[PDB]
Amino acid sequence: DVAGAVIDGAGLGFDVLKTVLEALGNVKRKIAVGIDNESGRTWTAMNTYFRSGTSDIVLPHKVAHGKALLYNGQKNRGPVATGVVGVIAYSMSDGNTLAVLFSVPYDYNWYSNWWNVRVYKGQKRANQRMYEELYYHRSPFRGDNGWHSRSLGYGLKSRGFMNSSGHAILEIHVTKA
């Protein structure tokens, strides 16, 4: 229980991500993240940048082709009106970086769920700079209960889904172009 689980790629789906959410218990804002590695490359965890919110687990360290990683986060605990906003960075065996943005706001009167995926040339750690590119400059997807596809370059693509609520799930599949 130091890291999030690694499961058979084919196992990843809505019910797995709801089980992850349920284990966090009834906190106001929380996310279950599932990324299926069908990239044909091994991933090695770099880091998670939390702009807001926290996790009691670290990224699964090694995620082979054919494996999905499970991850989670939740709002900072106590009377702060914040959500859970951060960036996951994995190193790929080609020397590049797979980056995932998740954004779950406190106030749905004015803000909505957002996610993003991208491949960076070389070894790039998750930080505020990467958050700002993925959020403000690289056409994030809305957590609109819709599936979205994108060509990542570097011979990969993504297909993913995020729901629209404060109890958020983010399912992503990286496959071969």
Numbering used by the authors: 3 to 179
The paper states:
The multigene family of actinoporins are a group of cnidarian pore-forming toxins produced by sea anemones well known for their widespread polymorphism. Strongly influenced by negative selection, actinoporins have conserved important functional sites to ensure the preservation of their mechanism of pore formation, a complex process involving many different steps. The steps leading to pore formation comprise (1) the binding of the toxins to the cell membrane, (2) toxin diffusion across the membrane plane, (3) protein oligomerization, and (4) translocation of the N-terminal α-helices through the lipid bilayer.
